[PDB]
């Protein structure tokens, strides 16, 4: 209810802020917190080192609502065609975030929630077995 929700939102804001400040000092709130910001950092580094190539490829995106899923699916299934690796997983997140940014830029904000669902499913059904075989996200954090 609305009363409980204000309590929950306050708690979430605190945890978010403390998690961030811990991370700035090489510490972490929790294992999941460490994963989230290893991923944020890895994506930033990927986009920074490969700014020229990543900018270029994202510039080529042609999105409409009726073709967005087809596009997302063809790109990710090609990305993983010959296997999975941690670098490809980072590329996958970076690509999804770029797809979202493009969608909002083009006044297709409706696609943002759709892309998030498509990615979460992809993680569950395509990528999870490899991730689990390769030491889970904690291994990505160490790596």
């Amino acid at each position: 209810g609305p009363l409980g929700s204000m309590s929950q939102s306050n708690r979430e804001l605190v945890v978010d802020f403390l998690s961030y400040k811990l991370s700035q000092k090489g510490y972490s709130w929790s294992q999941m917190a460490a994963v989230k910001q290893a991923l944020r950092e890895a994506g930033d580094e990927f986009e920074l080192r490969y700014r020229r190539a990543f900018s270029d490829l994202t510039s080529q995106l042609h999105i409409t609502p009726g073709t967005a899923y087809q596009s997302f699916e063809q790109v990710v299934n090609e990305l993983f065609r010959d296997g999975v690796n941690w670098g490809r997983i980072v590329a996958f997140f970076s690509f999804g975030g770029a797809l979202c940014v493009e969608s909002v830029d083009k006044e297709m904000q409706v696609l943002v929630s759709r892309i998030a669902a498509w990615m979460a499913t992809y993680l569950n059904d395509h990528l999870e077995p490899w991730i689990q075989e390769n030491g889970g996200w904690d291994t990505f954090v160490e790596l």
């Binding site: 490969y50 080529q60 063809q74 790109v75 990305l79 490809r88 997983i89």
Partner: peptide
């Protein structure tokens, strides 16, 4: 405009370069 196949090959290419830097084969 480059087709989705080109976008994906370019994305995988740099994902692989990024991987190779950090991860042992």
């Amino acid at each position: 405009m480059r087709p989705e196949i080109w976008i994906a090959q370019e994305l995988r290419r740099i994902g692989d370069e990024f991987n190779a830097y950090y991860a042992r084969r």
